Amino acid sequence: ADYQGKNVVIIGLGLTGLSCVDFFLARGVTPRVMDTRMTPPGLDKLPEAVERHTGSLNDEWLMAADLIVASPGIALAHPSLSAAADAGIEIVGDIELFCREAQAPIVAITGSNGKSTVTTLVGEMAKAAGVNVGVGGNIGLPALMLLDDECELYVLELSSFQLETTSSLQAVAATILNVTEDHMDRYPFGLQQYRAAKLRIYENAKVCVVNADDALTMPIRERCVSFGVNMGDYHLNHQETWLRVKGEKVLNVKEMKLSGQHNYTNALAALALADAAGLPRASSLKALTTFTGLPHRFEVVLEHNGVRWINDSKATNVGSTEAALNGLHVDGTLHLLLGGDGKSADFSPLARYLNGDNVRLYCFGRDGAQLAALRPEVAEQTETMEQAMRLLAPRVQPGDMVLLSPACASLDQFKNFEQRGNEFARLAKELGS
Numbered sequence: 043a044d045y046q047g048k049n050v051v052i053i054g055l056g057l058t059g060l061s062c063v064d065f066f067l068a069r070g071v072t073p074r075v076m077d078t079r080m081t082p083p084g085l086d087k088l089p090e091a092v093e094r095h096t097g098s099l100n101d102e103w104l105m106a107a108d109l110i111v112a113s114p115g116i117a118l119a120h121p122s123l124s125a126a127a128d129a130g131i132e133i134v135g136d137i138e139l140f141c142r143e144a145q146a147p148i149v150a151i152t153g154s155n156g157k158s159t160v161t162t163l164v165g166e167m168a169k170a171a172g173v174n175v176g177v178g179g180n181i182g183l184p185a186l187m188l189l190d191d192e193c194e195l196y197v198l199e200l201s202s203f204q205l206e207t208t209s210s211l212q213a214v215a216a217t218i219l220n221v222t223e224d225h226m227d228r229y230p231f232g233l234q235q236y237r238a239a240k241l242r243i244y245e246n247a248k249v250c251v252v253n254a255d256d257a258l259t260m261p262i263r264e265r266c267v268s269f270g271v272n273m274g275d276y277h278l279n280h281q282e283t284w285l286r287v288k289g290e291k292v293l294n295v296k297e298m299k300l301s302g303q304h305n306y307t308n309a310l311a312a313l314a315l316a317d318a319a320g321l322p323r324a325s326s327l328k329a330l331t332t333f334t335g336l337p338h339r340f341e342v343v344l345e346h347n348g349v350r351w352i353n354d355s356k357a358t359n360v361g362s363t364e365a366a367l368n369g370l371h372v373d374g375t376l377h378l379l380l381g382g383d384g385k386s387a388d389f390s391p392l393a394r395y396l397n398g399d400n401v402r403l404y405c406f407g408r409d410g411a412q413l414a415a416l417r418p419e420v421a422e423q424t425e426t427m428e429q430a431m432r433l434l435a436p437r438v439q440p441g442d443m444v445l446l447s448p449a450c451a452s453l454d455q456f457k458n459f460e461q462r463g464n465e466f467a468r469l470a471k472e473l474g475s
């Protein structure tokens with residue numbers, strides 16, 4: 043596309059907003075930036091000759107623009123954006139600018155849980171095949187920083203928010219791994235509106251890959267390739283567990299470093315997408331056996347003195363926490379940390395995992411009191427995650443697990459879930475020796 047001489051406004055700084063700034067400048071266009079935060083996260087990192095407005099949206103700037111580039115962190119439904127949409131002013135995001143320039147195929151991945159693990163996995167499968175691959179998007183680097191004429195494949199994690207402002211994506215392979223309640227603070231029309239945003243990823247996709255076990259991942263109306271536990275074009279076989287494609291065994295999971303059923307369906311989805319992208323199967327399977335997991339994803343930061351302390355800080359929703367608790371083996375007592383910005387989620391689904399004598403809850407952050415309510419007799423509420431740790435530490439016994447899998451965003455008290463996971467790791471180290 044050609045942006046020469048246009049009035050461009052970028053809404054939202056940070057890494058992404060910064061990457062969009064660089065994108066326009068390198069193309070000979072000086073945009074202007076605005077952010078509803080008085081002091082946004084990359085402000086002092088921004089070039090001097092770029093006009094910026096902070097502390098609110100600027101309607102004068104918006105209503106004058108030829109193109110608005112909106113961070114995924116601002117709602118399209120925001121009154122200033124809606125007004126500019128009503129006036130016919132074109133609104134895109136960073137993924138859209140990226141898709142209009144990219145000169146390699148894209149694998150596109152979204153879903154409420156598993157999306158970064160699959161994205162990473164498909165990226166390692168291309169690396170194992172000697173393919174020059176750029177991996178990023180909603181994980182790692184912002185898409186626009188991957189753009190390179192030499193790249194042979196892109197693998198992108200895409201959030202529901204990124205998908206709302208993207209229209210030119212034509213993925214070689216796209217998946218929605220699953221859809222469970224999340225971001226309800228951004229979706230006033232509920233779960234169906236949240237799903238609808240994710241369904242945008244299948245539009246003009248060469249192959250679509252659905253989860254046979256989750257109907258919501260399927261288009262509204264050829265067919266998609268599927269993965270699943272007992273069913274699907276890609277599926278599990280329990281003699282010991284194998285991954286199979288159409289009845290053929292391709293890998294015995296004991297060769298994987300990851301474990302758990304939900305990692306095995308991640309592996310299936312990753313394979314299916316690599317297959318659709320033309321990558322050789324042998325090297326794809328080799329990558330499955332070398333991948334050790336992402337940090338903050340059910341990560342054992344300390345196993346010592348009979349106690350395992352797990353950083354599952356990436357659990358930012360109810361679905362992810364269920365994944366950790368469902369089938370979880372604990373010898374003695376589980377000390378479960380819950381807390382932060384629940385985004386108006388229904389926590390009920392968690393209740394059925396919190397019975398029996400061998401469970402303790404330490405609830406903190408904005409929605410702490412709501413998380414304790416799940417079973418108040420076994421629950422403590424603190425303000426912070428630090429205070430919670432210092433409160434559970436003394437009670438920890440050989441055989442126990444300490445599990446940070448909070449079911450909420452960290453953004454009420456932290457920069458991001460990585461900072462929360464790193465703080466937990468530091469404290470677990472202090473308190474656990």
Ligand SMILES: N#Cc1ccc(COc2ccc3ccc(S(=O)(=O)N[C@H](CCC(=O)O)C(=O)O)cc3c2)cc1
Pocket residue numbers: 053054055056076077078079113114115116201203225358450451452453457458459460
């Ligand atoms: N203008 C403006 C403006 C821009 C950003 C913000 C708040 O700033 C952001 C920015 C970009 C984001 C992009 C994606 C997300 S996210 O919802 O997809 N990720 C969180 C992260 C959770 C966590 O890290 O704990 C979640 O799943 O809940 C949150 C974001 C939050 C406020 C005003």
